[PDB]
Amino acid sequence: SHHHHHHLEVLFQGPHMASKYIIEHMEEGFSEWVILEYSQILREVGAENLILSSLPESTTEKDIPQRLLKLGLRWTTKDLKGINEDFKDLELLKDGRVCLLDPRATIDLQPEDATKFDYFVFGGILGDHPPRDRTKELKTAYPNLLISRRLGDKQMTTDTAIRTTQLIIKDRIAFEDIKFIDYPEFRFNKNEATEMPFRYVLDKEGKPILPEGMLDLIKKDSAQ
Numbered sequence: 001s002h003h004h005h006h007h008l009e010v011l012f013q014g015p016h017m018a019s020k021y022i023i024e025h026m027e028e029g030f031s032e033w034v035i036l037e038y039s040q041i042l043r044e045v046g047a048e049n050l051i052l053s054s055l056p057e058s059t060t061e062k063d064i065p066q067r068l069l070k071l072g073l074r075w076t077t078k079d080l081k082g083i084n085e086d087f088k089d090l091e092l093l094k095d096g097r098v099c100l101l102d103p104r105a106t107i108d109l110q111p112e113d114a115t116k117f118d119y120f121v122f123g124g125i126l127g128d129h130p131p132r133d134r135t136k137e138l139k140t141a142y143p144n145l146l147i148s149r150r151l152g153d154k155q156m157t158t159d160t161a162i163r164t165t166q167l168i169i170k171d172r173i174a175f176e177d178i179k180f181i182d183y184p185e186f187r188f189n190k191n192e193a194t195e196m197p198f199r200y201v202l203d204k205e206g207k208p209i210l211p212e213g214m215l216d217l218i219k220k221d222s223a224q
């Protein structure tokens, strides 16, 4: 009775060829907000295409939210340069072929960058306004691995940055063609409304795309 000690999910997804998305986790633990965000990301890019890296060394499976485990989250306490040690199935993370999505970069990501990078890295950061520039910690941590690219001049949530990167790289849509809304207001009644100071991508109904559950969380907050 050893037959469950396997890596079938990995065998089933290979051989690797497709762009991957890596989130360097940079929050303590997993708040409800983070869980909803990461759940949405998993659903949009596919569990086989996401890695959550740099978790604290003491992290074990019980510390990972069951909602994320159920959606297939691949997670590791290794940093970017140790990911290949844990996940032997992934393509090598090659110097210069790993793109840091960096709000301060001087050059915006473009569809032709699909040819130029195999991995796209995001800070798992709940941003502040004004931004605290915490993404810069990644640039200093991996100075020869990463090349920075921008997603326009306003801050996006992690799931929005990944959604935008997928539209540019996978769907080959130029940034200037993506329909965004800057700093949307969410109003529910005369007593309850909240602005979110990020840039969001719009769905075909003209509404900002939020993780499932997030509008409920914003409504619960406004009701307090």
Ligand SMILES: C[S@@+](CC[C@H](N)C(=O)[O-])C[C@H]1O[C@@H](n2cnc3c(N)ncnc32)[C@H](O)[C@@H]1O
Binding pocket: 100, 101, 102, 103, 104, 121, 122, 123, 124, 125, 126, 127, 128, 131, 132, 133, 134, 135, 136, 149, 150, 151, 152, 153, 154, 155, 156, 157, 158, 161, 162
């Ligand atoms: C909410 S943001 C955090 C930004 C962080 N507060 C800062 O000022 O560096 C989450 C992640 O999505 C990516 N991101 C968000 N907005 C971006 C932009 N305008 N350009 C490039 N990457 C962006 C970055 O990888 C970032 O770490």
